Write an enzyme that holds these catalytic residues in place. Structure first.
Site: not given
Ligand SMILES: Nc1ncnc2c1ncn2[C@H]1C[C@H](O)[C@@H](COP(=O)(O)OP(=O)(O)OP(=O)(O)O)O1
Ligand SMILES: Nc1ncnc2c1ncn2[C@H]1C[C@H](O)[C@@H](COP(=O)(O)OP(=O)(O)OP(=O)(O)O)O1
Ligand SMILES: Nc1ncnc2c1ncn2[C@H]1C[C@H](O)[C@@H](COP(=O)(O)OP(=O)(O)OP(=O)(O)O)O1
Ligand SMILES: [Mg+2]
Lengths: 874, 89
Positions: A547, A549-551
């Site tokens: 996503n 924010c990469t989580e």
């Protein structure tokens, strides 16, 4: 030249008086034998000359100077001449005679200061200042806090008031001289917030017609009266969902705990008041505990036991044990509530679906939503296009449309897989210079990296770029299946049976990826295969990207836009006498997961494929915050084996409880539709996902700790019977909600122990409250220490007086070696089913250092990395 | 949806006239949020990029429209490119 005597009179300027004065001081330290000395006389007249000259040098034709102005210049001349013994006895004697004047003046003093200032009321009427109520609010504000002086604040305030002050800016005056004290004692931050609350109570209660004014402990009975008044006016103005009237407000009015207002830091209360409290005509009429009660109610509008669950949710929120995400806090309890604002999409390789994805981007962003876009399926430069009988220009011209949509709707991150033929242009989209037709300055980018590419980097192998239209099955494949199919296509191109391709050296593309990350901050590095091999939903879809924010690691397809429903545990509130409160943690996690599961049902959906995926799979993302502050409470430096151990075991504990909580919801609500076939059905928990990942990739390319401190076999059995949520955990950024609760950001190390906020009047420095607390125990908290911290911008390194154990414990983000942050994240990822937003801080800044770092991140089984913060100074 | 139509109708060299007068101008209230509209030009920028990516489009604006003065200058050769649409008539 004349001189203003001590008292009024004016006399001519006479060098003799200076010459006599200095001569007295020489004859005092020496004997009378110095009376006739060419030395003294020569020296004095030299000192007298450069004094008289100084007054002539700064002024034209005569002037007037103060008697003390001359005494100071006399001392200066003696001192610059190195006359240490005469200068100091001059100072001493001069001060002795100043003491006698000061005392004699105090003996002849007369006292007048009276009466009091008249406080001006809103209507325009004058009124005498209430001294009794002034002592009450400042005492209730200093209540329960150490090294805070109420009388000190009352005196410093009383100074800066004038006849005709308004009660509006009498409170702001109390606040102004309350936050000026946080520099020397952080607990004043709580005092500052409690004083500001007085304006909020008058503002809100006066609006609601409950009371025109009120104190803190007076809220013990007024919060219950204000709640029903708040709901009635809230629904009247259509600012609160009318369904909230279906609650038993009398019962909820009693559940409110007015003492939890004392928990607020100044920054936390400012944050809520400025942007989250409901308001009308600029007037905030939602008080903090009623704010938390609204969110709790909004999350419980469909529970069987509305009030019991609302109270359970209110207690969790108002205590700061857990905090819902920003959109939940803002919209819960309002009409058509946008409780989740994070989405993942995948773009199909047709023009209609491309512009359907642009359309979805706009709709999902209409209310501040964040977006991840998988653009890998879209065919690259040089691909054939039937009907047009031409050739595609690739994904970048479409990304330009995305970029301008983000500007038009007021973020989005585009993902591209590393074999995509447009990858080289993709890496450069965020360069400051160059052709603007090849730039997207308002769009984020991230690499979607297969394990095989990293394998080719480690082995100095080659790497072939393809257009997805020639290899449409690769993007959906992963693991061994991808590597076999990819090598099949690779062999095909080498035999001229796949014309459109490019062969590069893997190391060369890797170097370009790291140099762009260093120079532009983009694209980020995320790893496709661990996200897919460890996804619990492999049986019903594929993870096509992460996503914004990469989580987050959720499936997407033609009919599924994944939705991130998020909240975060406050680890600080689960640290007791130096230990993790295992018991209290389970209770908070159980309630947190339930609240997140409720978010799915209450959330108002704009696009139908977002509702479809949330209802089908019911993923949630429970994270953590206050990790760095939790380390402080244990006196563990972030750069140590002890912090890596705490990061491992604390995640294992939360994970057990979160998974266990999902089983409880499954017993009460039923498992999610697609539970059958998930990893959960197979008894493959995250800890087991790590093991299979090592088998698939091979130990030559991955090594991760596999230790365990709990007994998972019993829970591995109950999970196979059903859980409520396809995904449970994800560590997202917590900018606002950490500030609201007064803790450190998610898993971030402290960026700096000192910062200088300056946005109203002057500049106010804020120092790490944990650092100052430890420096007190050592007896090292004093003015010089404060002056050293400012000089060093908060770094406790290279200040001698601080012992080495504190230099390590309060190391800042850029003076903690990156390997500690990676290894810690690696062990947290063993228990998390999704991922975690991982910023990396690197001083020294070299391509060599970036190589070893992001090789290590991959080698340690990380799913994602986030921003790179790089300094080339070291 | 209108931008989607532009791409579909231009897929085979088609030409387009777009009426943009109904879209509300700079300063208009938006109940979607509680902010102000930035006008039609930020969306015309998306139209412009779509003409480029699908390569032909002419945008029309009525003379009382409050964005008209920005509209009149969309084809100047110099100035802020965020206020220009060089590939759109
Ligand atoms: N005429 C003057 N011109 C310039 N500086 C003078 C003059 N008279 C005094 N000063 C300065 C020099 C010394 O620092 C100090 C003089 O101290 P002092 O001789 O005690 O005078 P005073 O102003 O204190 O009155 P008093 O005679 O009561 O001490 O002030
Ligand atoms: N015994 C001494 N030791 C050191 N310095 C001396 C001594 N006597 C005089 N001085 C210096 C410092 C004084 O400013 C000055 C003497 O002037 P004097 O009038 O006695 O003091 P003063 O001007 O500071 O106070 P005041 O006049 O009010 O008593 O010369
Ligand atoms: N006019 C155009 N300008 C730019 N790109 C285009 C244009 N027409 C098509 N494309 C791109 C968009 C997609 O990435 C790709 C496929 O387009 P699309 O409309 O789906 O045709 P299609 O799917 O019906 O046929 P096919 O995929 O078999 O060639 O070509
Ligand atoms: Mg004197």
């Amino acid at each position: 030249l004349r001189v203003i005597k001590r008292n009024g009179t004016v006399v001519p300027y006479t060098d003799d008086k200076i010459t006599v004065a200095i001569t007295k001081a020489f004859l005092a330290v020496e004997g009378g034998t110095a009376a006739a000395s060419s030395r003294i006389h020569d020296t004095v007249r030299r000192l007298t000359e450069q004094v008289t000259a100084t007054f002539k040098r700064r002024m034209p034709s005569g002037g007037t100077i103060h008697i003390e102005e001359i005494q100071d210049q006399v001392e200066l001349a003696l001192m610059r001449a190195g006359e240490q013994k005469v200068a100091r006895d001059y100072v001493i004697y001069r001060e002795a005679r100043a003491a006698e004047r000061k005392n004699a003046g105090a003996a002849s003093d007369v006292a007048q200061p009276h009466p009091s200032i008249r406080i001006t009321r809103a209507d325009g009427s004058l009124s005498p200042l209430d001294m009794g109520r002034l002592n009450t609010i400042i005492s209730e504000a200093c209540e329960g806090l150490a090294e805070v002086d109420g009388a000190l604040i009352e005196r410093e305030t009383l100074k800066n008031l004038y006849d005709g002050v308004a009660e509006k800016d009498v409170n702001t005056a109390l606040v102004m001289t309350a936050r000026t004290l946080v520099e020397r004692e952080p607990n004043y931050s709580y005092v500052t917030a409690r004083l500001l609350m007085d304006t909020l109570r008058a503002e809100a209660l006066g609006f609601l017609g409950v009371a025109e004014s009120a104190t803190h402990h007076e809220m013990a009975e007024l919060y219950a009266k204000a709640l029903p008044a708040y709901i009635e006016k809230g629904a009247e103005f259509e600012l609160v969902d009318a369904k909230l009237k279906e609650f038993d407000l009398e019962k909820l009015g009693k559940a409110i705990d007015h003492e939890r207002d004392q928990q607020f830091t100044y920054l936390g209360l400012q944050t809520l008041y400025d942007r989250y409290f409901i308001h009308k005509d600029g007037i905030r009429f939602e008080l903090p505990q009623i704010f938390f009660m609204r969110v709790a109610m909004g999350l419980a509008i469909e529970e069987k036991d509305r009030e019991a669950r609302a109270i359970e949710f209110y207690n969790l929120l108002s205590s700061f044990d857990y905090m819902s995400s920003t959109p939940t806090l803002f919209n819960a309890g309002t009409l058509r509530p946008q409780l989740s604002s994070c989405y993942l999409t995948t773009v199909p390789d047709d023009l209609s679906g491309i512009y359907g994805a642009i359309h979805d981007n706009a709709m999902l962003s209409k209310f501040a939503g964040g977006l991840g876009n998988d653009w890998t399926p879209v065919r690259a430069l040089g691909s054939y296009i039937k009907g047009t009988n031409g050739k595609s220009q690739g994904v970048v011209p479409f990304l330009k449309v995305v970029n301008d949509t983000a500007v038009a709707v007021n973020a989005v991150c585009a993902y591209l897989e590393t074999w995509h033929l447009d990858i080289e242009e993709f890496l450069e989209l965020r360069k400051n210079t160059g052709d603007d037709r090849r730039r997207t300055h308002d769009m984020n980018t991230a690499n979607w990296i297969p394990d095989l590419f990293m394998k080719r980097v480690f082995d100095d192998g080659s790497w072939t770029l393809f257009s997805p239209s020639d290899v449409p099955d690769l993007h959906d494949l992963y693991g061994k299946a991808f590597e076999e199919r990819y090598e099949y296509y690779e062999a095909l191109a080498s035999y001229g049976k796949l014309k459109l391709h490019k062969v590069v050296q893997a190391k060369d593309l890797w170097r370009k990826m790291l140099s762009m990350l260093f120079e532009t901050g983009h694209p980020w590095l995320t790893f496709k295969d661990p996200c897919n091999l460890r996804s619990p939903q492999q049986h019903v879809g594929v993870v096509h990207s992460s996503n914004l924010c990469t989580e987050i690691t959720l499936n997407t397809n033609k009919d599924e836009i994944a939705v991130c429903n998020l909240g975060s545990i406050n680890l600080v509130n689960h640290i007791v006498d130096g230990k993790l409160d295992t018991a209290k943690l389970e209770k908070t996690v159980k309630t947190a997961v339930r609240m997140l599961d409720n978010v799915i049902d209450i959330n108002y959906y704009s696009v139908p494929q977002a509702q479809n995926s949330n209802f089908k799979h019911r993923p949630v993302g429970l994270g953590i915050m206050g990790f760095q502050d939790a380390l402080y409470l244990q006196h563990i430096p972030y750069g140590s084996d002890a912090a890596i151990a705490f990061a491992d075991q604390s995640m294992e504990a939360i994970s057990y409880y979160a998974i266990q909580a999902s089983c409880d919801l499954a017993d009460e609500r039923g498992a999610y539709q697609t539970f059958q076939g998930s990893l959960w059905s197979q008894g493959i928990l995250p800890i087991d996902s790590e093991k299979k990942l090592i088998e698939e990739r091979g130990a030559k390319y991955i090594e991760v700790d596999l230790s365990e401190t709990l007994d998972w076999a019993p829970l591995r059995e109950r999970v196979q019977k059903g859980i409520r949520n396809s995904n449970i955990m994800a560590i997202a950024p917590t900018a606002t909600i950490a500030n609201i609760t007064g803790v450190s950001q998610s898993i971030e190390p402290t960026y700096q122990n000192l910062y200088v906020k300056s946005n109203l009047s002057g500049e106010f420095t804020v120092i790490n409250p944990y650092l100052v607390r430890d420096l007190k125990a050592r007896g090292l908290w004093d003015p010089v220490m404060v002056n050293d911290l400012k000089y060093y911008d908060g770094s406790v390194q290279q200040i001698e007086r601080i012992p080495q154990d504190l230099k390590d414990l309060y190391a800042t983000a850029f003076e903690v070696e990156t390997r500690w942050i990676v290894e810690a994240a690696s062990r947290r990822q063993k228990w998390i089913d999704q991922a975690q937003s991982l910023n990396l801080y690197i001083a020294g800044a070299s391509g060599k250092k970036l190589d070893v770092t992001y090789r290590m991140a991959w080698f340690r089984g990380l799913k994602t990395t986030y921003y790179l913060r790089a300094l080339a100074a070291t």
